[PDB]
């Protein structure tokens, strides 16, 4: 079965290399989560630093793609950085060609089209990553758009990705059943970050220190990541609740 | 076994079999020896004939006035690599008015061989080379292998039964290293070294090949009646 080694159809109409690329997605054993506020979009991901010899500051799976767009990756870091560099280049070229900042959903589509090609063309393998793009779009407002190795993409009210993704997903589903709305009805991003961390704690059943987490925030006209000290402030605020 | 189909494949233990098979062609090749003092560097090569009617395959090729090599394995591959080396020595002269450092010659051969070990459709070079040269930092001897690995030595030997000559040189180190300002004595030590690798045969006039380069001696080749002096 050489139909299992390259991206051609199997007799049941399946692409095993694409399916096996989805399995590489969880190789890092990290879970990510994204939600939308009124003004903002927050993305949180677990930060696991096993080796003591590592420089913890260099260990990251969140990327600043453009001034406005941020991206968290679920998958091995080489493929992750490969996708990050490409997305940065694509976002820059878009601005140069068309005279405005590339929207989150359009970058998502473009990267999804790129992933689709690897599923159809044989010489290119799929990247073993899932890319969650976040921004506050100037037309669409707070935005989450996610890409996978199949070349599939869609916008989300909120989303999660990783080994224990389903727990987090249903946790969020249940909140939006109750809340009755499309987003976190909150003024400040600080409290939306607090929501994100809180519901991650419930769904995973685990506690986090400042160095166990990684947080990206998108507001109007900038996406930025939080330092450990900014996260510690956030954890403290949750504990005093 | 299942992983020796081409050079682009690693074995499960991390080996490159096509490179190792290329290395094997060197082992079947006729023996050749390299050694050097502080003033001169010598190549001695045992040449191989097809039969009694045939000539003896040349093993030594001149690269520049101050550099040259001996070969063991696929001869056309040595011709390719020696030609590349001639060009590199030449580029250094024409552009920089600079004799090519023997060490840089090593690096350039290493990088040329390596590209054939990482790409599909190609093949590793099937020859090993011994490069001697006298440059701005004295006498030098280099051992090239088609894996890409190049090594600087006081002396060595490659080819079939090269182990005899290599142990002799390993013993004789402290003596031959100080044969300074005497060409004929360093050559004798080289001929004696190659003799440890002979079996059911000894050195004849059209069988033996010597080359020397050093302080005030351009790289030159001795064959025929000009080697009788050393048998």
């Amino acid at each position: 079965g050489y139909d299992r080694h390259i991206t051609i159809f199997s007799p049941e109409g399946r692409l095993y290399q694409v399916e096996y690329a989805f399995k590489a997605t969880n190789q890092t054993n990290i879970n990510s989560l994204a939600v939308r506020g009124k003004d903002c979009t927050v993305v949180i991901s677990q930060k696991k630093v096993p080796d003591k010899l590592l420089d913890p500051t260099t260990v990251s799976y969140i990327f600043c793609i453009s001034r406005t767009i941020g991206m968290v990756v679920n998958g091995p870091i080489p493929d992750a950085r490969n996708a990050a560099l490409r997305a940065k280049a694509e976002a820059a070229e878009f601005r140069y060609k068309y005279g405005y900042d590339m929207p989150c959903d359009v970058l998502a589509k473009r990267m999804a089209n790129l992933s689709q090609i690897y599923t159809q063309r044989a010489y290119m393998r799929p990247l073993g990553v899932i890319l969650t793009f976040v921004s506050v779009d100037e037309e669409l407002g707070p935005s989450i758009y996610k890409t996978d190795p199949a070349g599939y993409y869609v916008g989300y009210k909120a989303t999660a990705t990783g080994p224990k993704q389903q727990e987090i997903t249903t946790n969020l589903e249940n909140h939006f059943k109750k809340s009755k709305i499309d987003h976190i009805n909150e003024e400040s991003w600080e409290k939306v970050v607090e929501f994100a961390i809180t519901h991650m704690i419930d769904a995973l059943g685990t506690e986090f220190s400042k160095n166990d987490l990684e947080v990206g925030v998108a507001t109007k006209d900038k996406f930025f990541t939080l330092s450990a000290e900014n996260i510690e402030e956030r954890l403290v605020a949750i504990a005093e609740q | 076994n299942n992983y020796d189909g081409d050079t682009v494949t690693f074995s499960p233990t991390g080996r490159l079999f096509q490179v190792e098979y290329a290395l094997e062609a060197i082992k079947q090749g006729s023996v050749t020896v390299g050694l050097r003092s502080n003033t001169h560097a010598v190549l001695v090569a045992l040449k191989r004939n097809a039969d009694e009617l045939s000539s003896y395959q040349k093993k030594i090729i001149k690269c520049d006035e101050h550099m040259g090599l001996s070969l063991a394995g696929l001869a056309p591959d040595a011709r390719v690599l020696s030609n590349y080396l001639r060009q590199q020595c030449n580029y250094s002269s024409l552009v920089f008015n600079r004799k090519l450092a023997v060490e840089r010659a090593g690096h350039l051969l290493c990088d040329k061989a390596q590209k054939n070990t990482q790409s599909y459709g190609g093949r590793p070079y099937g020859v090993g080379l011994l490069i001697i040269g006298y440059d701005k930092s004295g006498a030098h001897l280099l051992e090239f292998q088609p894996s890409g690995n190049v090594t600087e030595l006081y002396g060595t030997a490659i080819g079939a039964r090269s182990q005899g000559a290599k142990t002799y040189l390993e013993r004789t180190l402290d003596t031959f290293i100080k044969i300074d300002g005497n060409p004929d004595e360093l050559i004798k030590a080289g001929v004696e070294a190659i003799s440890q690798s002979l079996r059911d045969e000894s050195l004849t006039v059209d069988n033996l090949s010597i080359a020397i380069v050093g302080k005030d001696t351009p790289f030159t080749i001795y064959d025929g009646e000009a080697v009788a002096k050393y048998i």
């Binding site: 159809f9 010489y123 | 459709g121």
Partner: protein, 250 residues
């Protein structure tokens, strides 16, 4: 590096089948049901918006796409393959037609171009076939209303009405019973909604159903006034509300 796969990945087996086209069709079989019905004064194309998670926003995923102002497409099979085909189909309508003749291509010819792209993925070096079947509904001045199906092989056929994917065999039977040559557009929409309810299992409403028409011109959708011979697109995606309106009187 470089694409060293310059040879065909689809080849004839001893029996004469082209395996990858057959397997592509099998991928289409697994896909969600979609259909099209051709009325006298319009065409309807419809499908189910089968969401992946309720946290997804299924409005951001458009299964029915505008190709030209008078041509729309829907599919069954692999979504990402469909997405790039729509991208390529839009561009080819311009490069190989509009930029030459100053007008949009007629349905059959655009369909013809899409089929060409799909045929080439069945023979060119180093690619697999597209894993989709398309239904393309459209209008043009000299041919009127039309509906075409395009398969992974690159073959296309004109249809009065048909369905593709999951429950196509059943849906095609239900359409044979109901279709006649005197159908008005509203009647075809009604039949489309009935035919589709058969194949949908979960919720059946304006948020789970995607449905567009090729009908009358829409000056209100043109974007400008002042050129009376320009009357606007015949392609219109029915709103979530518009669909629910017709399910009360189902």
């Amino acid at each position: 590096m470089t694409d060293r796969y310059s040879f065909s990945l689809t080849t004839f087996s001893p029996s004469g089948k082209l395996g990858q086209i057959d397997y592509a069709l099998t991928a289409v079989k697994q896909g969600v049901t979609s259909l099209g019905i051709k009325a006298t004064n319009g065409v309807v194309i419809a499908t189910e918006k089968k969401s992946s998670s309720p946290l997804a926003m299924s409005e951001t995923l458009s299964k029915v796409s505008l190709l030209t102002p008078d041509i729309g497409a829907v599919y069954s099979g692999m979504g990402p393959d469909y997405r790039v085909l729509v991208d390529k189909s839009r561009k080819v309508a311009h490069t190989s037609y509009k930029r030459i003749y100053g007008e949009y291509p007629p349905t059959k010819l655009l369909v013809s171009e899409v089929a060409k792209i799909m045929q080439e993925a069945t023979q060119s070096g180093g690619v697999r076939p597209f894993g989709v079947s398309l239904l393309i509904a459209g209008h043009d001045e000299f041919n009127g209303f039309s509906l075409y199906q395009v398969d992974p092989s690159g073959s296309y056929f004109p249809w009065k009405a048909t369905a593709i994917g999951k429950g196509s065999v059943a849906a095609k039977t239900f359409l044979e019973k109901r279709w006649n040559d005197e159908l008005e557009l509203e009647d075809a929409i009604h039949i489309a909604l009935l035919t589709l309810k058969e194949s949908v299992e979960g919720e059946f409403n304006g948020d789970t159903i995607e449905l567009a028409i090729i009908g009358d011109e829409n000056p209100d959708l043109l974007g400008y006034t002042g050129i009376p011979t320009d009357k606007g697109p015949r392609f219109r995606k029915l709103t979530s509300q518009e669909i629910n309106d017709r399910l009360e009187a189902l």
